[PDB]
Amino acid sequence: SGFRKMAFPSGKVEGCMVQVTCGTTTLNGLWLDDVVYCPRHVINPNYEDLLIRKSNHNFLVQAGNVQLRVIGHSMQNCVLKLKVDTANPKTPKYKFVRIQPGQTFSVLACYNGSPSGVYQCAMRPNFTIKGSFLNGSCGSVGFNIDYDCVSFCYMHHMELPTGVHAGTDLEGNFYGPFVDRQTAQAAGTDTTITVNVLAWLYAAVINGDRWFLNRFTTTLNDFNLVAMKYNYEPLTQDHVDILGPLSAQTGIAVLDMCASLKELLQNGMNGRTILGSALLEDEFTPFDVVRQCSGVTF
Amino acid sequence: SGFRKMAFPSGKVEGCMVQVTCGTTTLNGLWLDDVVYCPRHVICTSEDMLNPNYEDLLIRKSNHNFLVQAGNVQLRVIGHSMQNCVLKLKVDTANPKTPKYKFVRIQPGQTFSVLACYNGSPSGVYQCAMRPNFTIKGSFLNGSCGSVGFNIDYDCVSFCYMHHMELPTGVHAGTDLEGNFYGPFVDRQTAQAAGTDTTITVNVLAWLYAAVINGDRWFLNRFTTTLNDFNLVAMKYNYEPLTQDHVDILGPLSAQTGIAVLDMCASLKELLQNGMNGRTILGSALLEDEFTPFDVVRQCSG
Ligand SMILES: O=C(N[C@@H](C(=O)Nc1cncc2ccccc12)c1cccc(Cl)c1)[C@@H]1CC[C@H](C(=O)N2CCCC2)O1
Ligand SMILES: [Cl-]
């Protein structure tokens, strides 16, 4: 029993964190095979013009108490790739994957190439993450684990004025309409990840919380009309299909659970809580719920 | 900016998780140097869990009855001893991944990270607090016994908890790494119940200072309170008494924000009376009590 916001074990990623210093700026890098990946802002910026002036020896890379020697450098979108002379002996089996809004991942927050904490979070529909980052956290990475393979999906680049965070995939493409420059940028109006709230309601049912259940069902169209009124993301047939296993395990049809969600949106919780929360939680995917309520290991 | 429930990086602990099997029972063990620590109930039988005599069950065992597996490698048990509710299995190999470590016993209100494991394999990491009733609100399934709680301040791992059982309310009970239970619990299937739980007041205050640090001030008021009047009000909402030690501990946060502890106490009294009125504090509609004053300083400053 119990339901916690759970991150993946971070050990495979900890063995990849390095410190990258260029001039006065120090941030984190990801050392995989013989390449160190880091945000290109470590160097109104013209990154090609700034990079052409830098030599390999201008980049100081430190893995623990060992200085790695940079033998090449190149830029791919907003990520800088520093070729080093040594392949990381701790390089795990990995992939670079780009995620969709609503998908969750673990973040290993780092400062000076040293991991300080690990937390779980979701890519918001407005492409920001509600992270916990201070100055020097740039280059910290987001990941998931599938059996023994680490899928890297995020690299931290910046904080927006509202306290939320923006970054890229490991190929340097930003999530959202953001640019790596000190300029006026703002996160768009955010929405609630509907499929994730439903997954969390199924997690509460599996954990013995049933007060919000009712005899009613609804249509996909009727529910989307309601969800649009409360700034909730539209629920698709794909989402309904994905929730199938949880619907079969609890005996509560996905549209039956939608009628519970509609009643909670129109009437509130009335002093009650669900899994120790007075708000509807949207940072657990249907897969996260199945993984935690079944105990999958890595 | 931001405030998340943050766990310590688990890598140093992952390299210590092993699987311990005795008979038909399999659970997790903690391999440090040449010793594997695990709950002693791994030696129990299905028919003897109400009143097990662990000394009598252990005397009948030999080293080869304990199967210890570290990854795909079987470790050889060369000795065994019991210390309170923990079984210590001496093995013929020191763990090359043994980090710098200490065994620490924590007090209620203290937080730690949990590396939940099944069959010696880590499945997840989450943040926890030792409740005032000495239970933890964890997320554990059958076979999670032996999973450990820890803090990693600097490069040293301080092991503070080992999971032993789930009580009927869905909460969890366990021991320190010396085998002493937290709370009035025993490792028997006899009727046991967690005592009435209360809110960790010093932690809620720490989290209110964290909200002030991140720019949230809506909940502050022009009032103050004596410590005794605050405690008279707090007890009515099932909040733990706030001691002078707690007031002293909150001193640094008070100096950083410019809000006296007893003024923050008056803001908490008002929140307990009024609720949040559709508002949130650090993205939460409830008053959070699983961040200590130390956690707030570490996450907000470094
Ligand atoms: O409940 C069991 N074990 C313990 C326990 O509480 N385990 C668990 C921990 N966390 C979460 C859990 C969620 C769901 C089910 C179990 C959970 C337990 C019970 C009572 C006293 C002690 Cl010290 C330990 C079952 C039934 C007996 C079997 C067991 O441990 N055996 C030893 C020898 C013969 C089999 O496993
Ligand atoms: Cl303590």
Side-chain angles (χ1 to χ4, degrees), chain B residues 40 43 48 51-61 82:
Chain B
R40 72 181 176 164
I43 72 183
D48 73 39
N51 293 285
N53 191 313
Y54 291 103
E55 173 196 359
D56 188 65
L57 291 173
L58 194 60
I59 204 59
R60 306 163 184 272
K61 300 276 168 170
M82 179 165 59

mmCIF file of all heavy atoms in Angstrom, chain B residues 40 43 48 51-61 82:
data_model
loop_
_atom_site.group_PDB
_atom_site.id
_atom_site.type_symbol
_atom_site.label_atom_id
_atom_site.label_comp_id
_atom_site.label_asym_id
_atom_site.label_seq_id
_atom_site.Cartn_x
_atom_site.Cartn_y
_atom_site.Cartn_z
ATOM 1 N N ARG B 40 15.221 -9.880 10.322
ATOM 2 C CA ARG B 40 15.355 -11.228 10.838
ATOM 3 C C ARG B 40 14.156 -12.114 10.465
ATOM 4 O O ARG B 40 14.330 -13.331 10.385
ATOM 5 C CB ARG B 40 15.638 -11.229 12.344
ATOM 6 C CG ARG B 40 14.458 -10.829 13.214
ATOM 7 C CD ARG B 40 14.844 -10.829 14.671
ATOM 8 N NE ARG B 40 13.753 -10.347 15.516
ATOM 9 C CZ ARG B 40 13.690 -10.514 16.833
ATOM 10 N NH1 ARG B 40 14.642 -11.188 17.474
ATOM 11 N NH2 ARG B 40 12.635 -10.088 17.509
ATOM 12 N N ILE B 43 13.841 -15.624 8.403
ATOM 13 C CA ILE B 43 13.970 -16.997 8.887
ATOM 14 C C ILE B 43 12.618 -17.595 9.309
ATOM 15 O O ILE B 43 12.576 -18.784 9.607
ATOM 16 C CB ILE B 43 15.039 -17.110 10.008
ATOM 17 C CG1 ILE B 43 14.534 -16.485 11.319
ATOM 18 C CG2 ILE B 43 16.361 -16.500 9.546
ATOM 19 C CD1 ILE B 43 15.534 -16.464 12.479
ATOM 20 N N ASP B 48 4.528 -20.026 11.711
ATOM 21 C CA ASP B 48 5.050 -19.460 12.952
ATOM 22 C C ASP B 48 5.333 -17.959 12.863
ATOM 23 O O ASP B 48 6.441 -17.534 13.199
ATOM 24 C CB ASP B 48 6.273 -20.252 13.505
ATOM 25 C CG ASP B 48 7.612 -20.122 12.773
ATOM 26 O OD1 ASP B 48 7.944 -18.996 12.316
ATOM 27 O OD2 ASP B 48 8.341 -21.135 12.682
ATOM 28 N N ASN B 51 3.977 -15.718 16.970
ATOM 29 C CA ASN B 51 4.874 -15.728 18.121
ATOM 30 C C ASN B 51 6.190 -16.444 17.800
ATOM 31 O O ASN B 51 6.498 -17.477 18.401
ATOM 32 C CB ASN B 51 4.166 -16.414 19.321
ATOM 33 C CG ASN B 51 3.003 -15.624 19.818
ATOM 34 O OD1 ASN B 51 3.171 -14.608 20.486
ATOM 35 N ND2 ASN B 51 1.804 -16.055 19.468
ATOM 36 N N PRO B 52 6.957 -15.961 16.810
ATOM 37 C CA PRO B 52 8.231 -16.612 16.501
ATOM 38 C C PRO B 52 9.280 -16.451 17.607
ATOM 39 O O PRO B 52 9.370 -15.402 18.228
ATOM 40 C CB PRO B 52 8.680 -15.925 15.206
ATOM 41 C CG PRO B 52 8.024 -14.613 15.238
ATOM 42 C CD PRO B 52 6.758 -14.745 15.998
ATOM 43 N N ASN B 53 10.062 -17.497 17.860
ATOM 44 C CA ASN B 53 11.173 -17.427 18.794
ATOM 45 C C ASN B 53 12.375 -17.390 17.870
ATOM 46 O O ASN B 53 12.837 -18.428 17.421
ATOM 47 C CB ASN B 53 11.233 -18.670 19.671
ATOM 48 C CG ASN B 53 12.193 -18.549 20.836
ATOM 49 O OD1 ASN B 53 13.338 -18.109 20.705
ATOM 50 N ND2 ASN B 53 11.740 -18.957 22.015
ATOM 51 N N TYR B 54 12.836 -16.190 17.534
ATOM 52 C CA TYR B 54 13.936 -16.005 16.600
ATOM 53 C C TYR B 54 15.241 -16.669 17.013
ATOM 54 O O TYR B 54 15.966 -17.137 16.136
ATOM 55 C CB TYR B 54 14.144 -14.525 16.311
ATOM 56 C CG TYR B 54 13.011 -13.941 15.501
ATOM 57 C CD1 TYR B 54 12.030 -13.162 16.105
ATOM 58 C CD2 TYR B 54 12.894 -14.206 14.144
ATOM 59 C CE1 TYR B 54 11.000 -12.608 15.370
ATOM 60 C CE2 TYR B 54 11.851 -13.677 13.398
ATOM 61 C CZ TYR B 54 10.919 -12.854 14.012
ATOM 62 O OH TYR B 54 9.880 -12.305 13.297
ATOM 63 N N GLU B 55 15.555 -16.714 18.317
ATOM 64 C CA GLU B 55 16.777 -17.385 18.774
ATOM 65 C C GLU B 55 16.654 -18.901 18.480
ATOM 66 O O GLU B 55 17.606 -19.531 18.004
ATOM 67 C CB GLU B 55 16.994 -17.149 20.290
ATOM 68 C CG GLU B 55 18.153 -17.947 20.881
ATOM 69 C CD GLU B 55 18.171 -18.050 22.397
ATOM 70 O OE1 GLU B 55 17.273 -17.464 23.045
ATOM 71 O OE2 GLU B 55 19.081 -18.719 22.938
ATOM 72 N N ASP B 56 15.458 -19.467 18.721
ATOM 73 C CA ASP B 56 15.226 -20.885 18.454
ATOM 74 C C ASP B 56 15.237 -21.185 16.934
ATOM 75 O O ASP B 56 15.757 -22.211 16.527
ATOM 76 C CB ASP B 56 13.923 -21.372 19.106
ATOM 77 C CG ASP B 56 13.778 -22.877 18.990
ATOM 78 O OD1 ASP B 56 14.608 -23.599 19.579
ATOM 79 O OD2 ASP B 56 12.850 -23.331 18.289
ATOM 80 N N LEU B 57 14.658 -20.297 16.114
ATOM 81 C CA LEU B 57 14.652 -20.480 14.662
ATOM 82 C C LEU B 57 16.066 -20.360 14.074
ATOM 83 O O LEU B 57 16.428 -21.140 13.179
ATOM 84 C CB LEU B 57 13.736 -19.437 13.993
ATOM 85 C CG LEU B 57 12.240 -19.600 14.264
ATOM 86 C CD1 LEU B 57 11.450 -18.419 13.710
ATOM 87 C CD2 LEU B 57 11.728 -20.955 13.695
ATOM 88 N N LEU B 58 16.866 -19.394 14.593
ATOM 89 C CA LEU B 58 18.221 -19.132 14.098
ATOM 90 C C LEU B 58 19.243 -20.211 14.462
ATOM 91 O O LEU B 58 20.127 -20.490 13.666
ATOM 92 C CB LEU B 58 18.727 -17.750 14.555
ATOM 93 C CG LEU B 58 19.977 -17.217 13.825
ATOM 94 C CD1 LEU B 58 19.742 -17.082 12.338
ATOM 95 C CD2 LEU B 58 20.403 -15.872 14.380
ATOM 96 N N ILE B 59 19.135 -20.808 15.651
ATOM 97 C CA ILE B 59 20.054 -21.868 16.086
ATOM 98 C C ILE B 59 19.989 -23.102 15.161
ATOM 99 O O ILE B 59 20.985 -23.816 14.997
ATOM 100 C CB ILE B 59 19.845 -22.231 17.591
ATOM 101 C CG1 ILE B 59 21.108 -22.856 18.225
ATOM 102 C CG2 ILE B 59 18.664 -23.143 17.798
ATOM 103 C CD1 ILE B 59 22.309 -21.930 18.159
ATOM 104 N N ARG B 60 18.827 -23.330 14.533
ATOM 105 C CA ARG B 60 18.620 -24.450 13.620
ATOM 106 C C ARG B 60 19.197 -24.219 12.225
ATOM 107 O O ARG B 60 19.316 -25.163 11.447
ATOM 108 C CB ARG B 60 17.128 -24.813 13.551
ATOM 109 C CG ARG B 60 16.533 -25.073 14.923
ATOM 110 C CD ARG B 60 15.020 -25.033 14.931
ATOM 111 N NE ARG B 60 14.467 -25.189 16.275
ATOM 112 C CZ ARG B 60 14.188 -26.349 16.851
ATOM 113 N NH1 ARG B 60 14.473 -27.491 16.234
ATOM 114 N NH2 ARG B 60 13.683 -26.383 18.077
ATOM 115 N N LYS B 61 19.595 -22.995 11.923
ATOM 116 C CA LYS B 61 20.134 -22.639 10.633
ATOM 117 C C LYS B 61 21.624 -22.804 10.561
ATOM 118 O O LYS B 61 22.341 -22.536 11.518
ATOM 119 C CB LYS B 61 19.824 -21.164 10.326
ATOM 120 C CG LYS B 61 18.357 -20.852 10.285
ATOM 121 C CD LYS B 61 17.776 -21.178 8.944
ATOM 122 C CE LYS B 61 16.275 -21.148 9.000
ATOM 123 N NZ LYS B 61 15.669 -21.234 7.642
ATOM 124 N N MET B 82 22.420 -12.321 15.028
ATOM 125 C CA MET B 82 21.245 -11.493 15.127
ATOM 126 C C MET B 82 21.553 -10.336 16.067
ATOM 127 O O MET B 82 22.188 -10.535 17.112
ATOM 128 C CB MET B 82 20.106 -12.359 15.683
ATOM 129 C CG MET B 82 18.800 -11.636 15.876
ATOM 130 S SD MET B 82 17.434 -12.800 16.094
ATOM 131 C CE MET B 82 17.951 -13.763 17.572
#
